[PDB]
């Protein structure tokens, strides 16, 4: 009927239960403009929905409501790459149609995209510590960890600048010999950071093969949280339809987690501990549910989200809740960025349980897992001896602590220092890790087998 009330950003309207769950509705205002909204929850002759554009402008007793009769679905096609689009529908380079040949849901109910096997195709992003220490492949879910106070937008601009040149380095390794596509989804990002991220992809030469989804910070949280489902549905539809490799970068997860806290403030549900709701694991599981290898045994859709720690730790609900759905993450240190390093990713708080399944034959080696454990043990020994060396001094430290301290300084300024346009190979990263690991004796190395360590010594 009319708008019954409004509590925060969401409005509570009294209508009939003829509309389905998540069905699109059109609110008719008396100002001469119609607005679209999504039904967040249904009730007993009551409905709680949020407006897609704006929050003010509706009436109280003179408002009019109407049902569209169609659920929320974005038309996906094969011509979405190259053009510039928006999350809510702001056309700046788009026309009347989006070139959508099929109708797919934004939740992945009838699709169910997920891999039923371990990833064999190795994918590299141009980082020696990320590719060598993590060993990520196609269909893996590993998010990037950030911090509050450090340049997370510069690390996301460097990771976005590295996306596009990984195909020529991966083609020589024999890990990727197919088409490559990039799915860019932005929500709650600045215009200068989105212009620099689009300028990095335009300078790299991946503007025609990449799609851009722009979402503003002053818009509603339903459009910013709804844009990654449409971008993941377009990347899953393009990657599943042609058997191509699609890489999806979702930035930022803190804007979606902060936008999810504003929602549910006028419904029956309530928030949980620390301001975030207790059902946020299903909301992050809905976006992460469309990640993995596609059905067909050809191609896959990889997901690499960018999350920033608001408290500089993993005890928060945003990195702790998102880290539980994944199987590890990469920790970026601000201490390495303060002294000067690009990227300042550390190897102490980083571990992946899919490094053995990702490494195969013909595109990787067998000593990379032992060299990563030996480099993580030497970096943990040097980082552990570096904190104890400040308190007591250099009078009670042995040669083993000085070897790990020299290995941490030698490997800290060599492996962590790299360019933003050059992509290092996995064999050059393992050969550079063997030179940094070749500072100690052969008897002092026990994180590898003796047969493989004696051959590659």
């Amino acid at each position: 009927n009319t708008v019954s009330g409004v509590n925060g950003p969401l409005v509570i309207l009294e209508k009939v239960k003829f509309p389905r769950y998540n069905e699109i509705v059109n609110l008719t205002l008396p100002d001469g403009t119609v607005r679209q909204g999504q039904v967040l929850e249904i009730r007993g002759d009551r409905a709680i929905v949020q407006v897609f554009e704006g929050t003010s402008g509706i009436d109280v007793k003179k408002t009019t409501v109407e049902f569209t009769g169609e659920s929320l679905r974005i038309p996906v096609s094969e011509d979405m790459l190259g053009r510039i689009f928006d999350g809510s529908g702001r056309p700046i380079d788009n026309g009347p149609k989006v070139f959508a040949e099929d109708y797919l849901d934004i939740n992945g109910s009838p699709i169910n995209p997920y891999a039923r096997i371990y990833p064999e195709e190795m994918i590299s992003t141009g980082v020696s510590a990320i590719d060598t220490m993590n060993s990520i492949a196609r269909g893996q879910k590993i998010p990037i960890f950030s911090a509050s106070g450090l340049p997370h937008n510069e690390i996301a601009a460097q990771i976005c600048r590295q996306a596009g040149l990984v195909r020529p380095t991966k083609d020589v390794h024999d890990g990727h010999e197919e088409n490559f596509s990039i799915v860019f989804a932005a929500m709650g990002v600045n215009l200068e950071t989105a212009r620099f991220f689009k300028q990095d992809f335009e300078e790299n030469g991946s503007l025609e093969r990449t799609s851009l989804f722009l979402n503003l910070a002053n818009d509603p949280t339903i459009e910013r949280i709804i844009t990654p489902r449409l971008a993941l549905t377009t990347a899953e539809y393009l990657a599943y339809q042609t058997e191509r490799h699609v890489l999806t970068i979702l930035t930022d997860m803190s804007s979606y987690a902060d936008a999810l806290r504003e929602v549910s403030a006028a419904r029956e549900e309530v928030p949980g501990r620390r301001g975030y709701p207790g059902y946020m694991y299903t909301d992050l599981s809905t976006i992460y549910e469309r990640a993995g290898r596609v059905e067909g045994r050809n191609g896959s859709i990889t997901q690499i989200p960018i999350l920033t720690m608001p408290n500089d730790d993993i005890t928060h609900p945003i990195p702790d809740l998102t880290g539980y759905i994944t199987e590890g993450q990469i920790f970026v240190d601000r201490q390495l960025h303060n002294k000067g390093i690009y990227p300042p990713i550390n190897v102490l708080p980083s571990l992946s349980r899919l490094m053995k399944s990702a490494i195969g034959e013909g595109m990787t080696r067998k000593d990379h897992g032992d060299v990563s454990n030996q480099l993580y043990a030497k970096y943990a020994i040097g980082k552990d001896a570096a904190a104890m060396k400040a308190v007591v001094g250099e009078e009670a430290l042995s040669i083993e602590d000085k070897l790990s301290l020299e290995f941490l300084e030698k490997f800290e300024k060599t492996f962590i220092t790299q360019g933003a346009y050059e992509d290092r190979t996995v064999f050059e990263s393992l050969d550079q890790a063997w030179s940094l690991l070749r500072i100690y004796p052969k008897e002092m190395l026990n994180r590898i087998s003796p047969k493989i360590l004696d051959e590659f010594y």
């Binding site: 309530v270 949980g272 501990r273 620390r274 308190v391 007591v392 001094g393 009078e395």
Partner: protein, 51 residues
């Protein structure tokens, strides 16, 4: 040996006095405010759910 022990005792007393003087207060003062902030953050979610 007397000249070695007289040189070692001045380093040992300064190291023990520096570590014992610098050890406890930052961790205790941080742990008390972390426990109070965890108590208030644990109390606010129960207050909103009770409301």
């Amino acid at each position: 040996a007397f000249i070695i022990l007289d040189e070692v005792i001045k380093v040992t007393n300064r190291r023990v006095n520096a570590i014992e003087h610098v050890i406890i207060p930052r961790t205790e003062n941080t742990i008390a405010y972390i426990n109070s902030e965890l108590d208030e953050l644990d109390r606010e979610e129960f207050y909103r759910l009770k409301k």
